[PDB]
Design an enzyme around this catalytic site. Sequence first.
Site, PDB file in Angstrom:
ATOM      1  N   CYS A   1       0.854  -1.227   0.000  1.00 27.10           N
ATOM      2  CA  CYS A   1       0.000   0.000   0.000  1.00 27.10           C
ATOM      3  C   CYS A   1       0.864   1.242   0.000  1.00 27.10           C
ATOM      4  O   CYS A   1       1.554   1.488  -0.967  1.00 27.10           O
ATOM      5  CB  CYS A   1      -1.144  -0.122   1.038  1.00 27.10           C
ATOM      6  N   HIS A   2       0.940   1.978   1.117  1.00 28.74           N
ATOM      7  CA  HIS A   2       1.890   3.074   1.239  1.00 28.74           C
ATOM      8  C   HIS A   2       3.277   2.628   1.631  1.00 28.74           C
ATOM      9  O   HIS A   2       4.193   3.439   1.683  1.00 28.74           O
ATOM     10  CB  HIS A   2       1.409   4.109   2.271  1.00 28.74           C
TER      11      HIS A   2
END
Lengths: 171, 169
Positions: A104-105
């Site tokens: 994700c991040h």
Amino acid sequence: TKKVAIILANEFEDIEYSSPKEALENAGFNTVVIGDTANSEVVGKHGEKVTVDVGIAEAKPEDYDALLIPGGFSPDHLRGDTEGRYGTFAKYFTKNDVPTFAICHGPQILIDTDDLKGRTLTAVLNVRKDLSNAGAHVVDESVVVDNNIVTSRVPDDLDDFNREIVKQLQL
Amino acid sequence: KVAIILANEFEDIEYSSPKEALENAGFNTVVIGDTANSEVVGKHGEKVTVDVGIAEAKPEDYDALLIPGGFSPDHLRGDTEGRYGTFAKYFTKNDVPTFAICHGPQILIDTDDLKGRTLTAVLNVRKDLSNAGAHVVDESVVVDNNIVTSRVPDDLDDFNREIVKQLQL
């Protein structure tokens, strides 16, 4: 026995900590949470409380067989470290080709290694342009394996992510 | 009139303080967000009503663009269509006043118009601004022609001074 460092600040996406942790432990590996202060508590976006095992100042990256970077806003917080200690920690893994898992991040911290040029990664939409500006070949796939680096985008990708990270530690 | 692009988890004071400074100087603000008449909520609970949905918004309507920080800019960069980056491109391409504080400059990355521009921001996003080709410095406020940037809430007096001065010119 093999163990994985998980770098973690507040506002991690809870399931991106817990699910890979469970997958790794189910395969017989152990996990250690690395954060600002040993024995401090970090709290996920959805309230999950996690105790930090080892402080980033004390951690020796060579002790760990893999690095796991959960997403949410935890990676952005880690990147606020004035001395850049989490990017430096991650640099051990990218420089030495040690298994490196980010969802994700999570791949935000990998930008701070300066080691991404020519590597192939995915991430959450929000960060893909930054990864590309860091030199990566960015794709949009549920899981991407580039030698030692395993990346995924979103929590729906976890089944694919968890399968690949465990495989990569079996080597 | 100043467009403010805003999602949930904006840093409360980086919305309210520049809004008040602008409004005090006699300028008007319009919150642009996912859907008109919805509420977005700051990190510290401030509720802000969205005036105009990003689907309908026309960047030429506006005299400036303001981007508050917190995690609002990251949320905006999650828009499937990239509509907030596209909205911002109008301001960078046409050299219209563009104001961004803390994480706010993240949205300017998506314009692809930061090469050779001089900006500051919160520490967390400086590497990404440099990788976008910006000259990143560490100062309380930075003015590069039309682009005004600051780092953190403490900078607000300086930020507000410069954004108001842009609109007066």
